[PDB]
Amino acid sequence: YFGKLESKCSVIRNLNDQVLFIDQGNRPLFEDMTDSDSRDNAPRTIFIISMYKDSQPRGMAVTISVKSEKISTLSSENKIISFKEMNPPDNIKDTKSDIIFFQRSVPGHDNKMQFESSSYEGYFLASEKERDLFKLILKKEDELGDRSIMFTVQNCDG
């Protein structure tokens, strides 16, 4: 079971220092900071990472949420990326949850982080190029050295 401990304002960047944002269509994408849309994208670059105490310690249990008009929370349900219409909860009774990811650092690189679905072992948040776009996806990943599943997290609380 999980219990929420603290929430932190966060900016998430991929392997190429592109910044995660939510577009008009509620799609999680990555922007180059010289992109012409970076001005309009800027409010949608802010994520809330909430840390959870875990009765079955496997990694740092977190939810990732966005604050638009209302709060929505990132989900790995059905092995894809979506946003559940829900604030991060105070308590979660189960040991696995579609909104809980295990955040862990990369061996030798304490600042590089990987987020594993707690529902689907071996599935990770990843950056993927798809035509002209860079998309946040849920990727079945056998190779933990794959830099496309590595992110940095910058605190904006201060």
Side-chain angles (χ1 to χ4, degrees):
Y1 58 94
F2 306 91
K4 190 160 64 154
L5 290 179
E6 52 179 90
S7 289
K8 280 169 170 175
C9 178
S10 306
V11 169
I12 298 164
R13 290 174 179 85
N14 69 8
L15 76 167
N16 292 324
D17 276 331
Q18 295 166 319
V19 170
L20 176 72
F21 74 99
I22 305 309
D23 85 346
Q24 301 281 71
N26 259 294
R27 291 193 299 171
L29 303 173
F30 295 91
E31 58 171 1
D32 296 292
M33 296 304 320
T34 70
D35 288 353
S36 62
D37 293 326
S38 56
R39 188 191 290 100
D40 297 331
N41 287 340
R44 313 289 325 250
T45 62
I46 301 308
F47 292 82
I48 309 295
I49 300 178
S50 308
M51 179 183 72
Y52 285 73
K53 189 195 210 183
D54 189 350
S55 69
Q56 186 174 317
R58 290 155 281 176
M60 179 168 90
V62 299
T63 60
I64 299 156
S65 46
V66 306
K67 184 142 190 22
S68 148
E69 322 299 316
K70 64 270 190 163
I71 301 190
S72 300
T73 300
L74 193 68
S75 173
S76 61
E77 161 162 50
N78 299 320
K79 296 180 185 183
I80 53 145
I81 291 295
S82 70
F83 280 94
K84 218 166 145 93
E85 298 283 331
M86 95 153 287
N87 316 324
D90 284 340
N91 299 287
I92 302 170
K93 281 167 217 143
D94 223 336
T95 59
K96 299 177 161 154
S97 167
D98 288 336
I99 62 171
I100 289 280
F101 294 85
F102 298 120
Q103 176 182 337
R104 305 176 186 98
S105 65
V106 168
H109 308 272
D110 287 358
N111 66 305
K112 302 214 208 153
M113 298 283 173
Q114 298 177 336
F115 300 87
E116 188 172 10
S117 166
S118 74
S119 299
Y120 301 109
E121 190 152 17
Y123 285 73
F124 290 80
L125 297 186
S127 179
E128 196 148 272
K129 190 169 184 313
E130 205 214 79
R131 277 161 298 270
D132 294 336
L133 309 208
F134 298 86
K135 275 152 64 163
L136 180 70
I137 66 160
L138 189 74
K139 170 184 190 172
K140 169 143 171 33
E141 178 70 82
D142 304 297
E143 287 320 313
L144 290 202
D146 188 345
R147 291 186 299 271
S148 72
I149 66 159
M150 291 186 190
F151 301 91
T152 55
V153 175
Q154 179 180 25
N155 192 311
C156 25
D157 301 310

